[PDB]
From a paper:
G protein-coupled receptors (GPCRs) are ubiquitous cellular gatekeepers in eukaryotic organisms. Concurrent ligand exchange and crystallization is then initiated by overlaying a protein-laden LCP bolus with precipitant solution containing a large excess of the ligand of interest.
To demonstrate the general applicability of the described Complex-LCP method, we applied it to four other GPCRs: serotonin receptors 1B (5-HT1B) and 2B (5-HT2B), adenosine A2A receptor (A2AAR) and melatonin receptor type 1A (MT1). A2AAR is another prototypical GPCR, which similarly to β2AR has a large number of available ligands. A2AAR has been crystallized in complex with many different ligands, including the relatively large antagonists ZM241385 and comp-1, the agonist UK-432097 and some smaller, high-off-rate antagonists such as XAC, caffeine, PSB36 and theophylline.
Numbering used by the authors: -2 to 208, 1001 to 1043, 1059 to 1106, 219 to 308
The structure:
Amino acid sequence: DGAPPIMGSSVYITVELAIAVLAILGNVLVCWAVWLNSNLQNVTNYFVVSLAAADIAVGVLAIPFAITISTGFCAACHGCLFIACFVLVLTQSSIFSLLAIAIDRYIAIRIPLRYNGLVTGTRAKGIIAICWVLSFAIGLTPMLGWNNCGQPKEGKNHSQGCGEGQVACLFEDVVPMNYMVYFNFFACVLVPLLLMLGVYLRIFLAARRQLADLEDNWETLNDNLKVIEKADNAAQVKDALTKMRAAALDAQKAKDFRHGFDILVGQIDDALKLANEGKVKEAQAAAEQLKTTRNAYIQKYLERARSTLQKEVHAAKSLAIIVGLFALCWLPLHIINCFTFFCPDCSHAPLWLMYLAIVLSHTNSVVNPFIYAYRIREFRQTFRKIIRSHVL
Ligand SMILES: CC(C)CCC[C@@H](C)[C@H]1CC[C@H]2[C@@H]3CC=C4C[C@@H](O)CC[C@]4(C)[C@H]3CC[C@]12C
Ligand SMILES: CC(C)CCC[C@@H](C)[C@H]1CC[C@H]2[C@@H]3CC=C4C[C@@H](O)CC[C@]4(C)[C@H]3CC[C@]12C
Ligand SMILES: CC(C)CCC[C@@H](C)[C@H]1CC[C@H]2[C@@H]3CC=C4C[C@@H](O)CC[C@]4(C)[C@H]3CC[C@]12C
Ligand SMILES: Nc1nc(NCCc2ccc(O)cc2)nc2nc(-c3ccco3)nn12
Ligand code: NA
């Protein structure tokens, strides 16, 4: 007695197939958008496409494999291992793509003038190819001998009636838990996720430091202007102009734009030469000209630089959400494996919970297209064009 297994199995399979359809459709849309729209064709989005391709493969291959292995069918043990482990190749490829995106955005905010000479489409393609090769080697490592094929469950294999060399193909019977916990979870998943967390933290800190510096230079200009306006001594004017000048050079370091800071620094130097030669009123008078240069050029370039940095912060937040949802969808299965491995006195997690955790991991292959659509205008607008035109 006990409910016929096919009833629970029918629910599981139906849900897996629903997820597969949505993973394929949404991620084909991502790839189509990058293909269509040259504004989306940049290095960051080559990693986005590599990630979308891994999620298409979850729907086309990993989900049919998961349905197959849920039956415990008789198979040659190394064929069984390939079906069991292929999803780990795809999840490792996703991890590498996510890590590359984070580093890409970190380079872009740290050394933006060197970014385009360092990070090229050709180098990115080589990186993607290497990461896919490494992904196959890591995810299929059990097929090199780190497996339980030498210790078959002969009770299961006779009750199912399997032949010679065949095992009942069940994940936990063939894939060792020490591989899943120490090698896959700790070294290959958790360590990269923590590195990604640290990279994103460094991105937000760099942005916050650059914004504060911008602001410091701005009020250094304005404060020292007031000093000159309230001064009554040549060297109180000269000293303020001197500090205004370094602030201006630092702002310029950090063509029409050049004309702005040239008028500004030229005007400072004019007022300085008057200051040195004792003419305080001529110096103060020359220094009030700076205000129209400030209003006409310097404020406009402060504003553009602030909004560029605010755009990069908003973009990095969007990409970090992707990483967060990856962790939220995969950590339950890893944590369950930790209980199975480290607590032999604990009852095994129940079968319904195992399959809920499996389904949750697969749902990760559905969500990224929705993030892009809600958070990234250029994707959203291109999705809209594709749907309205080629679908409506
Ligand atoms: C989509 C196309 C391009 C490639 C798909 C190939 C897949 C379906 C092939 C490649 C290797 C194959 C496996 C190789 C060995 C075995 C062991 C046997 O006892 C049962 C079948 C099984 C488990 C095969 C199932 C089908 C399989 C997984
Ligand atoms: C990352 C977020 C979503 C947290 C998810 C935590 C989940 C995976 C945790 C919270 C409570 C945990 C359960 C607590 C108690 C037991 C009983 C034990 O005999 C087997 C493990 C099992 C069944 C745990 C499995 C993992 C578990 C379900
Ligand atoms: C969230 C990320 C950053 C860290 C993940 C922490 C994981 C590794 C932690 C959280 C809860 C922990 C489990 C809590 C309780 C037990 C029961 C004990 O008898 C064996 C260890 C075991 C099973 C722990 C293993 C490690 C564990 C799963
Ligand atoms: N532990 C585990 N089991 C399964 N499937 C088998 C579930 C099960 C567990 C016990 C049992 O007697 C019958 C079925 N798939 C699994 N996939 C993973 C996985 C992928 C990434 C991290 O863990 N872990 N994992
Ligand atoms: Na993925």
